[PDB]
Write an enzyme that holds these catalytic residues in place. Structure first.
Site, mmCIF file in Angstrom:
data_model
loop_
_atom_site.group_PDB
_atom_site.id
_atom_site.type_symbol
_atom_site.label_atom_id
_atom_site.label_comp_id
_atom_site.label_asym_id
_atom_site.label_seq_id
_atom_site.Cartn_x
_atom_site.Cartn_y
_atom_site.Cartn_z
ATOM 1 N N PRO A 195 34.566 24.864 44.035
ATOM 2 C CG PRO A 195 33.901 22.654 44.394
ATOM 3 C CD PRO A 195 34.273 23.907 45.134
ATOM 4 C CG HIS A 196 31.232 28.357 38.880
ATOM 5 N ND1 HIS A 196 30.611 29.331 39.614
ATOM 6 C CD2 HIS A 196 30.688 28.366 37.635
ATOM 7 C CE1 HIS A 196 29.729 29.931 38.844
ATOM 8 N NE2 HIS A 196 29.778 29.383 37.633
ATOM 9 C CB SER B 21 30.850 30.548 42.958
ATOM 10 O OG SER B 21 31.644 29.831 42.015
ATOM 11 C CB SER C 191 35.788 26.254 47.766
ATOM 12 O OG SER C 191 36.894 26.252 48.649
#
EC number: 5.3.2.-
Lengths: 76, 76
Positions: free
Chosen positions: B1-2, B40, B38
């Site tokens: 996920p960002h 950021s 995963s």
């Protein structure tokens, strides 16, 4: 504060969405000294084949400014 | 996920930014069944006079889908 969460698709029911929003809210209140009414949170599902666009526009160009860098890379 | 966090300016040193990132990371791992690698996270400070553009492009159009709606309105 406005928080945007982008991730690959997954099924989240209303209870799940609200609990995630509540946990994010309290983290933001703690670290940014924010009031509840100032916070908005979006959750956007991105198909895997559209993740490169997110990498190129949001991750790679801002890499050393990120407060958390990705453990993965799309430019190996 | 960002995760992208936008907020009005505040004095945040690197230890404070890392602590915010760590707490966001835990929440994301627990709610999205995610991994540290995963995730950021971006933090962008926006002067108050430039918040209208954020309302117009990000908040207002997504009102129908936000997982947490703001406690204020700024339709202009």
């Amino acid at each position: 504060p406005h928080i945007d969460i982008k991730c690959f698709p997954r099924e989240l029911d209303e209870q799940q969405k609200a609990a995630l929003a509540a946990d994010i809210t309290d983290v933001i209140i703690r670290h940014l000294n924010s009031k509840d009414s100032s916070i908005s949170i979006a959750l956007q599902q991105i198909q895997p084949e559209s993740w490169q666009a997110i990498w190129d526009a949001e991750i790679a160009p801002q890499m050393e400014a990120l407060i958390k860098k990705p453990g993965y890379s799309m430019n190996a």
